[PDB]
Amino acid sequence: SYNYAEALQKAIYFYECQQAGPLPEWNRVEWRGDATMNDEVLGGWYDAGDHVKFNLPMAYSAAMLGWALYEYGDDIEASGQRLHLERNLAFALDYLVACDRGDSVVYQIGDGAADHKWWGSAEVIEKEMTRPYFVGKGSAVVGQMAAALAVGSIVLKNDTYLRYAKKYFELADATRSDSTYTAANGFYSSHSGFWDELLWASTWLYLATGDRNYLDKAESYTPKLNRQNQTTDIEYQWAHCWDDCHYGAMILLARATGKEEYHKFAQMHLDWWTPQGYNGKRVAYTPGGLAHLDTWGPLRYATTEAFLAFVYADSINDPALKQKYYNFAKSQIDYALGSNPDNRSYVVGFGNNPPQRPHHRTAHGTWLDKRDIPEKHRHVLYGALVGGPGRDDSYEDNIEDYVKNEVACDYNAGFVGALCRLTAEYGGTPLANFPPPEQRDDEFFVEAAINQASDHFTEIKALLNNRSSWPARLIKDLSYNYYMDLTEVFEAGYSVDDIKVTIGYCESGMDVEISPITHLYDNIYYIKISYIDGTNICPIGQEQYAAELQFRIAAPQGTKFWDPTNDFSYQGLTRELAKTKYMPVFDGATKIFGEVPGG
Amino acid sequence: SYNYAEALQKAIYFYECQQAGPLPEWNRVEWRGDATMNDEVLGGWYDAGDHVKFNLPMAYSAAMLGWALYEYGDDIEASGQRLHLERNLAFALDYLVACDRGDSVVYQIGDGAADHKWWGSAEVIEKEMTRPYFVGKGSAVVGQMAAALAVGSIVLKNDTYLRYAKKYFELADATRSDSTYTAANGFYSSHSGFWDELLWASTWLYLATGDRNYLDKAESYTPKLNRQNQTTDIEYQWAHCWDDCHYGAMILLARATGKEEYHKFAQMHLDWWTPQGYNGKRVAYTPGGLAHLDTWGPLRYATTEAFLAFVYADSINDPALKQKYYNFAKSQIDYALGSNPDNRSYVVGFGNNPPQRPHHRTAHGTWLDKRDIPEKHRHVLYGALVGGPGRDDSYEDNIEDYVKNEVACDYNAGFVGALCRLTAEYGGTPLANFPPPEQRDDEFFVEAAINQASDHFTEIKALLNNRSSWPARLIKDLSYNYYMDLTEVFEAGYSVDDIKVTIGYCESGMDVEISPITHLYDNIYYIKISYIDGTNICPIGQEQYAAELQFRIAAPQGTKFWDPTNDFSYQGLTRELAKTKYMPVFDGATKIFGEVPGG
Ligand SMILES: OC[C@H]1O[C@@H](O[C@H]2[C@H](O)[C@@H](O)[C@H](O[C@H]3[C@H](O)[C@@H](O)[C@H](O)O[C@@H]3CO)O[C@@H]2CO)[C@H](O)[C@@H](O)[C@@H]1O
Ligand SMILES: OC[C@H]1O[C@@H](O[C@H]2[C@H](O)[C@@H](O)[C@H](O[C@H]3[C@H](O)[C@@H](O)[C@H](O)O[C@@H]3CO)O[C@@H]2CO)[C@H](O)[C@@H](O)[C@@H]1O
Ligand SMILES: OC[C@H]1O[C@@H](O[C@H]2[C@H](O)[C@@H](O)[C@H](O)O[C@@H]2CO)[C@H](O)[C@@H](O)[C@@H]1O
Ligand SMILES: OC[C@H]1O[C@@H](O[C@H]2[C@H](O)[C@@H](O)[C@H](O)O[C@@H]2CO)[C@H](O)[C@@H](O)[C@@H]1O
Ligand SMILES: [Br-]
Ligand SMILES: [Br-]
Ligand SMILES: [Br-]
Ligand SMILES: [Br-]
Ligand SMILES: [Br-]
Ligand SMILES: [Br-]
Ligand SMILES: [Ca+2]
Ligand SMILES: [Ca+2]
Ligand SMILES: [Ca+2]
Ligand SMILES: [Ca+2]
Ligand SMILES: [Cl-]
Ligand SMILES: [Cl-]
Ligand SMILES: [Cl-]
Ligand SMILES: [Cl-]
Ligand SMILES: [Cl-]
Ligand SMILES: [Cl-]
Structure with a gap:
């Protein structure tokens, strides 16, 4: 099979490659230094292969990392990766706390158009441009921030994160509007609306506090969720993702209340992802066996679903359903790690014939504001899950393809939880002297x-x-x-x-x-x-x-x-x-x- | 009608503006220094508003200045201009001698295309480009050079000029081909062929030597002259000009031999130029009274014919013909001087409202290879006869108009001789302090x-x-x-x-x-x-x-x-x-x- 512990090791390291300055003393990335030190809010993660701090996918990604620890933190002690994951997550949560502005938050650092127009390393970007910040109280972004801090407070045993989680939740829930969320437009626009984020945040606050007031809030949001097309069902034909976390909130509510409606949702949604489908309806599948939701970052979507599926299966007793969900989940992870028609890893620096040209500025290490020079990347972005192949399994490792060769916080996040699950089960030994020195x-x-x-x-x-x-x-x-x-x-x-x-x-x-x-x-x-x-x-x-x-x-x-x-x-x-x-x-x-x- | 001595004074001073380096001690132009000192052959005149040395018009201009002295030299001593005219002519003849290469001559310095692409002053052109020279034995160019030296040898009493006139004539007459005359194509192409130059050179050698053999030669060329259209007559419907001197040659042979064939030709030719015309055929006339041969340099053609007309009228006795030819001649010159629909001089720095923006590089005095800056010329190109007006007497003084506002050696050459004839008759007092200092x-x-x-x-x-x-x-x-x-x-x-x-x-x-x-x-x-x-x-x-x-x-x-x-x-x-x-x-x-x- 695969060394799932090594894959987790690398998948976590990826987040160290994404850290804005000041770097923590424990940062293991020799080609990263303090960068963007003039930012209005320091620390946190660059979102993708760029240098914008986008708080929605950032907070999403941290919430998913906290979820991994919450499910499987004890189960990954063997791999030695628990402490790495914990400190990498605090780094982002500290940023979310630092965004507090009283009646609002800093929700973005960087103008996406200007950031994207330039190709070069993080540490020198201030010589090229001044980075603006943006403040508001959008319910989706503030709610996802609350969610991240709530799960964070639990797995990291931290009162401060819990206090901010509550504050952010009340803010998002008072505001009930994404109208002050503008600066991410066209990059991380709120497509689904904010009701899913209020559901996800209140669910995690219920899990953090045991206060049934948060359970009452959470359940009160489910009739506000978008419907599947023109029907009365809650939308299920999509993935848990940076924009929409109602999927995982329903799974969490299934286990915490045991109520029928949440299990019916969970199984409807998860069934639609499996090769067996839900009443004849199913996600697109490549001939190679990848569940292919969309052109953009299909591996991100499928690996996140593998995580939800593992968690739901671990939480039920029916062996038929457990096997079906487990086999779906493992099949998606294994595709990403090499079980595909090209037998190639889609994880940078991992496995057989991994991608070598991810669309990632700082890992590329140019001096010229060009993507073609140098013709090889100067650094190894270990662990980064790329976008992935097309509906037909087709793929080229090309730095220009920001669709198939993009990398991102949100790509790695659910993937990390899934790898935690697979390591817990199959163990594996992490690399001894990782990371090795670059030429x-x-x-x-x-x-x-x-x-x-x-x-x-x-x-x-x-x-x-x-x-x-x-x-x-x-x-x-x-x-x-x-x-x-x-x-x-x-x-x-x-x-x-x-x-x-x-x-x-x-x-x-x-x-x-x-x-x-x-x-x-x-x-x-x-x-x-x-x-x-x-x-x-x-x-x-x-x-x-x-x-x-x-x-x-x-x-x-x-x-x-x-x-x-x-x-x-x-x-x-x-x-x-x-x-x-x-x-x-x-x-x-x-x-x-x-x-x-x-x- | 006009102060003809002043016009003559200025018309000669024009050639001093044209002189290439090294300049003689007596050069009176404060804004001219030694220029193009790296040329294969030094001295001579820049042809026009440019810096090419084009031997065909250069020598033609010299021969015409020599002719002026030959006819009216003693008659202009009152004007004070005889010495000025003589040494100016000597300057160009010295250049023609210096062009000798034995079985060939240098016939051009500068490449027309290369020279004309650039706009700036003579003395700095070597910083801009490197000037070629060209060697050959074209019968037209070698023939014209011989003619200039032949007349020069008479008026300047100079055995060296005669020696080289004879050298060049023998080369031109042995070669009988324009095949090696190529470097001026498109600028001063040999259009008429070379028979006219041989006729012109041999006529002047006869007048210089009295050697009967040159007369026989000259007469032997007459059957080879171009015909007028499909007819039997020698071509008469053009002007004596840099390309074709058979007109003046026939006038000279009329006087030298008294033969009827030459007198018949001269009268036919001159009649075609007069307002009465020749049996219903006539040069175009502007309504303002300028005989207008061509859109290019019309004043040049008319004023040269004024000189031929003066010479032929002074050489016959018929009172009606004399008055007809003299009236024609004086009317062309007076048009150039200001008897025109605008009452304006077409000689720079002379008379009422003269041109101030001639198409002349060094007179303009730019510093940045532009015609439009500076917007006023820095220098006064005294004496230059411009191209002149269109067929309807229209004209604008515009640096860009290289048709109407061109100036050239050949434009001034016949003109000088006609002004000699006029000052001889009406006198006039030249300017005492000329040239005055520039601002x-x-x-x-x-x-x-x-x-x-x-x-x-x-x-x-x-x-x-x-x-x-x-x-x-x-x-x-x-x-x-x-x-x-x-x-x-x-x-x-x-x-x-x-x-x-x-x-x-x-x-x-x-x-x-x-x-x-x-x-x-x-x-x-x-x-x-x-x-x-x-x-x-x-x-x-x-x-x-x-x-x-x-x-x-x-x-x-x-x-x-x-x-x-x-x-x-x-x-x-x-x-x-x-x-x-x-x-x-x-x-x-x-x-x-x-x-x-x-x-
Ligand atoms: O309407 C169907 C579903 O849409 C979901 O939102 C998605 C947008 O429709 C889709 O355009 C967008 O794509 C992003 C991509 O996620 C990101 O990786 C890339 O950099 O930019 C793309 C272009 O914006 O993704 C979102 C979320 O997956 C809704 O969330 C869902 O409710 C709805 O069913
Ligand atoms: O064809 C009629 C007559 O042509 C004469 O040649 C002239 C060319 O036809 C004419 O194109 C050329 O024009 C010159 C112009 O004189 C000069 O000032 C300008 O800078 O460039 C133009 C292109 O060279 O002028 C010549 C000479 O008049 C023949 O000499 C004549 O025999 C013939 O009948
Ligand atoms: O937004 C899609 C994609 O864009 C990437 O940046 C572009 C940028 O939009 C354009 O201005 C520039 O000329 O080319 C770059 C490189 O494609 C950005 O790098 C990605 O993060 C982003 O996914
Ligand atoms: O030969 C015609 C005329 O050309 C003038 O030179 C041009 C030149 O040919 C062109 O390259 C440049 O762009 O403009 C100049 C000025 O019009 C040249 O100056 C004249 O002497 C010449 O009679
Ligand atoms: Br001081
Ligand atoms: Br606000
Ligand atoms: Br290693
Ligand atoms: Br040393
Ligand atoms: Br004066
Ligand atoms: Br001083
Ligand atoms: Ca001082
Ligand atoms: Ca949402
Ligand atoms: Ca040394
Ligand atoms: Ca000729
Ligand atoms: Cl690599
Ligand atoms: Cl390279
Ligand atoms: Cl030769
Ligand atoms: Cl008449
Ligand atoms: Cl002037
Ligand atoms: Cl100016």
């Missing part, structure tokens, strides 16, 4: 070329690069040195002041200084090129990743002695721009790349 | 703007301009100074070494240095911006006429003393670029523009 590239370096050369001068075209990625970062006090040998000038009967330093081109907006020619030792001299605000050299675009200077060092015109062939920093240069080690880069007084004459 | 604008200067101001720095955007025009020219050792008062620095406890100079932008290809901050006197200091090869600041285009530099002069970050309001070079600067006199420009050690503190 790194040079991050700060000069590329140089002989721009023009004559028998009295050397002209150098120098581009000081910031292509950092481990993590992408900014360095203000950047400089580099050009080392020369003046033996031939002295031997011909000339001196240092016979040699003059000039500039032939200085890139606009890169405030720059060049030192006088300076003695190092013997006949070896150098100039330092210093950028006053080196942070403007950053991997955010075609123009910004490198600063260009053209400088000339010249002997008096007409003369013939100049010999650049013995100059340390001239070594290996051609007419073509290339990386060189012999023009070393410094951060303040510390050399960070290259070599120096002697030492 | 100049500033040529080298800084435009500056406050690029950014802060409580601890000044940042300047500075453009060092070369919009030279009197004459357009190149300066290598260009620099300018930025002056500051550092009183507030010292009063706050800081030193000169606490003030840092950086660069925020340096235009590509402009080798520049900036001095350390330098003491002038008291608490006045400066930095000198020096361009190592300032000849790259030149008025040849939008990028070239100025070098942009952004520099910053900064006290430490955090300090509050910096005060630009007492800095000499800050006076008057705003956030928009403007010329400033307080950032003086230097050529080497010489201040060429602006003011210095304490002076």
